[PDB]
Ligand binder design. Structure first.
Ligand SMILES: Cc1nc(NCc2c(F)cccc2F)c2c(-c3ccnc(N)c3)c[nH]c2n1
Ligand SMILES: [Cl-]
Length: 336
């Protein structure tokens, strides 16, 4: 009774799946680590709730990464592999490859100190490859929920990562669901109710990489007004040419005499627009985030300037000008 299924541990499904542990619940239902008796390998099984909303979302997710499986390319390997699917005990079940803990657990491991710029660089490259694969014309898949939680390590003692959770995913010209992207990673086009393309995932990747290295969220809004006001602290007021074409622009800003845009009141107070420099957040010249990387190998001002430039390309207010996967992979921040 209710949405969920039966958690036991030790139970064996279809004389094939030996269930030993629950990895973690999601909005969509459960994920469990089990053993495959016929393929002789470990598997994580996504158990979708017995509801239309989540089932319909699962059917899209199934369809999208089946489509990804057709492509002959090394790059497809940065997306989680779906081995098979079957309905069982009235639940849709997706069998995936076993991966490891997410990048939010890896940050919690360091007590939110952040990982090294060297590891942040490896993550940034694998994700830029993954976003590139998604952008293949035949695919043109917009994940719409990229965040540390949906980025998983393959093995806990190694740097290789993959993207998971394509329940929220759509395809370029579509406007299916009311709510897309996690608030902290929500790109400003989505905050202002403007149409969105594959550019919104690159804005999420930008916020994620800064958090990976500083150890904390770049823009941690409690609500949508908080989110925009905190993005404005770092990047200033958005372009007038953007705010002039945005349905929800007059939620957060106000048109002035000069045809200019100034902020609305705190109601009841943020740092003035663009005064919370990304220079001091990364601490390019003050020994890295909170001074914690001072003296440390591979944490030079030169290295912090290249990372800073690349993140600022990814945090472009303009989705037309924001850096695309193919070109972010040519950046000096990755230069060999
Ligand atoms: C250790 C582990 N873990 C995994 N999942 C971790 C996890 C949770 F435990 C709970 C909620 C979301 C989530 F990604 C997964 C998934 C997975 C899971 C969900 N959706 C997709 N598309 C893939 C595949 N392999 C996994 N391996
Ligand atoms: Cl709000």
């Amino acid at each position: 009774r209710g949405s969920h299924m039966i958690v036991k541990n030790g139970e064996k499904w279809m004389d094939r799946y030996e269930i030993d542990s629950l990895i973690g619940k999601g909005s969509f239902g459960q994920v469990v680590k089990a053993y495959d008796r016929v393929e002789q390998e470990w598997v994580a099984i996504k158990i979708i709730k017995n509801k239309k909303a989540f089932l319909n979302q699962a059917q899209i997710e199934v369809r999208l990464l089946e489509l990804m499986n057709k492509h002959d390319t090394e790059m497809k390997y940065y997306i989680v592999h779906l081995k098979r699917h079957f309905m069982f005990r009235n639940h849709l079940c997706l069998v995936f490859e076993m991966l490891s803990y997410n990048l939010y657990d890896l940050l919690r491991n360091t007590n939110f100190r952040g990982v090294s710029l060297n590891l942040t660089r490896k993550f940034a490259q694998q994700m830029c490859t993954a976003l590139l694969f998604l952008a293949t014309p035949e695919l043109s898949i917009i994940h719409c929920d990229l965040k540390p939680e949906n980025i998983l390590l393959c093995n806990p003692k190694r740097s290789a990562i993959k993207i998971v959770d394509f329940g929220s995913s759509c395809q370029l010209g579509q406007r299916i669901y009311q709510y897309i992207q996690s608030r902290f990673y929500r790109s400003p086009e989505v905050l202002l109710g403007m149409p969105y393309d594959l550019a919104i995932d690159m804005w999420s990747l930008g916020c994620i990489l800064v958090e990976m290295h500083t150890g904390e969220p770049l823009f941690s809004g409690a609500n949508e007004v908080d989110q925009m006001n905190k993005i404005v602290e770092v990047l200033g007021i958005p372009p007038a040419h953007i705010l002039d074409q945005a349905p929800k622009a007059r939620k957060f800003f106000e048109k002035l005499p000069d045809g200019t845009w100034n902020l609305k009141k705190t109601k009841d107070e943020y740092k003035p627009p663009g005064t919370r420099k990304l220079h001091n957040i990364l601490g390019v010249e003050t020994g890295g985030p909170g001074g914690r990387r001072a003296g440390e190998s591979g944490h030079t001002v030169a290295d912090y300037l290249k990372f800073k430039d690349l993140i600022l390309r990814m945090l472009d207010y303009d989705p037309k000008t924001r850096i695309q996967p193919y070109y972010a992979l040519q950046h000096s921040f990755f230069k060999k």
